[model samples]
Target: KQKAVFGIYMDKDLKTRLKVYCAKNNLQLTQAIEEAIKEYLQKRNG
Candidate 1:
């Protein structure tokens, strides 16, 4: 198995909001982002 490191600058408030939401849902931020990207790609393919 392999993994890629992705780094980006995010607005403070938005980033905090996402972190809080992920915490509330018991999700890692990476997991959320991965799921989001997968959904986007699938929708684009349709």
Candidate 2:
């Protein structure tokens, strides 16, 4: 798959929590965020 860079901003606490969640799930932060967005869109469209 081709990869591209995008920027996101989150509040400090949310960022910290997301980082920990990603670590616990053995995912890079970017992967976790991307997966979340895809899931959200799927649910919204379906």
Candidate 3:
């Protein structure tokens, strides 16, 4: 499937925190967001 480019806003602290946290875990920040949204949807459905 093709990927979508999404736009969102964040403060410097949250932005950097997410980037650094993802770096430490060897994950792309966007991938982390994708998983988070997927989990959120799953929870909402149940």
Candidate 4:
């Protein structure tokens, strides 16, 4: 099965910071977003 594509617009500074954080953590942007959504759903459901 294929996954859906999600998109969002963010502030330039925030995007830059996120990219830097991803670089430092050695994670791709996609992976970072997936991790964030995972925690979001888990916390929201509890």
Q: Please give the CA lDDT of all the candidate structures.
A: 0.83, 0.83, 0.82, 0.81
Model 1, 1-46: lDDT tens per residue? 3789989987888777767879999889888777777899999994
lDDT of 3 by residue, 1-46 (tens): 6888988776888778878888999889898877767899998994
Better of 2 and 3 by TM-score: 2
Clashes of 1: 0
Residues 1-46, model 2: lDDT tens digits? 7999987776888777878988898789888878877899998995
Candidate with the larger lDDT of 2 and 3: 2
Tens digit of per-residue lDDT, candidate 4, span 1-46: 4688877887888777767879999889878877777899998994
Residue 43, candidate 3: C-alpha displacement in angstroms? 1.4
The parts of candidate 2 lying over 4 Å away from their true place are: none
lDDT of 4 at 34: 75
* Consecutive 10-residue window with the lowest summed lDDT within model 4: 1-10
Candidates 3 and 4, the one with greater TM-score:
4
Q: What is the full ranking by TM-score, best candidate first?
A: 2, 1, 4, 3
Estimate TM-scores for all models.
0.65, 0.72, 0.64, 0.65
Q: Which candidate gets the maximum TM-score versus the true structure?
A: 2
**Candidate 1: TM-score?**
0.65
